[PDB]
């Protein structure tokens, strides 16, 4: 039976950056599958926290989900004091929808063509130029300031209020390089309009093959990504978690949804409710070190 009306996909970011991106994808499969409009509601402000604290009190009934984030599941905490909900007690985990690599890019006439390149550069300069924040908190921003921690380099970050508004800057050189998710920055590197240095992970990302990783491109062992979820209101029935988990896993372990995600700059998550919940508690241990490392807390 469920569902039987509209189901809302509250996405914490505006159009343009991944985890919209990633959540039309989600939205269109689901409607096709069950029959019934997943609507996106994209509710900014505060790197999500406005979103997942109106989630956090909504009706447990199936028809509101979270698309989840680093910052709203593990990051957050690093750099808002208060936020409005408890991201451990408050959500159920779904599913894990994405694991993305994160990607350092400079503006075009930033003239440097290589994460080496870069750190001389910016050692030249101590504190003069700046970087692209999508969201306080989020892996771009930790990344780069783990970056700087690894490096030495000192620039200066520009929190935007997603990705899409941070892009644009980026490209007009209003701020000099970031590091953000690949799948908002991929069609600025097709057409050309920032230039693309290396992706954050460990490996190499397959469709971007000859991209180096940072760690091989001069700071050894960094590696990062970010990542993407479904979840539900506390309380939300078992039966509901579990037919959504399903659909979304025959997605994302399809040849067909692999390549969609892929196409996209995406890894394909899947795997269960308690994976998510795994993947979470790692993830929010991992990063609270990296945090401390960097010199990041709240104020
Ligand atoms: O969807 C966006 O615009 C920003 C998502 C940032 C996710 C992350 O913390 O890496």
């Given at each position: 039976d469920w569902?039987?009306?509209?189901?809302?996909?509250?996405?914490?970011?505006?159009?343009?950056?991944?985890?919209?991106?990633?959540?039309?994808?989600?939205?269109?499969?689901?409607?096709?599958?069950?029959?019934?409009?997943f609507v996106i509601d994209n509710?900014?402000?505060?790197?999500?926290?406005?979103?997942?604290?109106?989630?956090?009190?909504?009706?447990?009934?199936?028809?509101?989900?979270?698309?989840?984030?680093?910052?709203?599941?593990?990051?957050?905490?690093?750099?808002?004091?208060?936020?409005?909900?408890?991201?451990?007690?408050?959500?159920?985990?779904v599913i894990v929808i994405a694991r993305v690599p994160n990607l350092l890019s400079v503006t075009k006439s930033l003239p440097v063509t290589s994460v080496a390149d870069l750190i001389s550069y910016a050692r030249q300069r101590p504190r003069e130029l700046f970087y692209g924040v999508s969201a306080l908190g989020s892996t771009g921003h930790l990344s780069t300031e783990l970056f700087k921690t690894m490096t030495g380099v000192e620039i200066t970050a520009v929190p935007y209020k997603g990705s899409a508004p941070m892009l644009r800057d980026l490209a007009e050189g209003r701020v000099?390089?970031?590091?953000?998710?690949?799948?908002?920055?991929?069609?600025?590197?097709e057409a050309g309009e920032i230039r693309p240095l290396a992706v954050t992970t460990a490996k190499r990302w397959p469709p971007l093959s000859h991209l180096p990783t940072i760690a091989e491109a001069g700071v050894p062992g960094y590696?990062?990504?970010?990542?993407?979820?479904?979840?539900?209101?506390?309380?939300?029935?078992?039966?509901?978690?579990?037919?959504?988990?399903?659909?979304?896993?025959?997605?994302?372990?399809?040849?067909?949804?692999?390549?969609?995600?892929?196409?996209?700059?995406?890894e394909p998550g899947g795997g269960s409710p308690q994976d998510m919940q795994r993947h979470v508690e790692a993830e929010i241990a991992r990063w609270e070190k990296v945090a401390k490392t960097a010199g990041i807390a709240p104020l």
């Open positions: 569902p039987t009306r509209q189901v809302t996909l509250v996405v914490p970011f505006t159009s343009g950056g991944t985890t919209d991106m990633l959540a039309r994808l989600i939205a269109a499969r689901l409607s096709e599958h069950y029959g019934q409009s509710r900014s402000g505060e790197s999500g926290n406005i979103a997942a604290s109106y989630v956090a009190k909504v009706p447990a009934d199936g028809y509101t989900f979270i698309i989840g984030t680093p910052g709203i599941h593990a990051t957050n905490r690093l750099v808002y004091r208060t936020m409005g909900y408890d991201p451990a007690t408050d959500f159920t985990p000099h390089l970031t590091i953000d998710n690949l799948p908002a920055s991929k069609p600025l590197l590696e990062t990504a970010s990542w993407f979820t479904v979840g539900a209101p506390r309380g939300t029935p078992t039966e509901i978690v579990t037919s959504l988990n399903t659909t979304v896993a025959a997605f994302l372990g399809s040849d067909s949804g692999t390549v969609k995600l892929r196409e996209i700059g995406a």
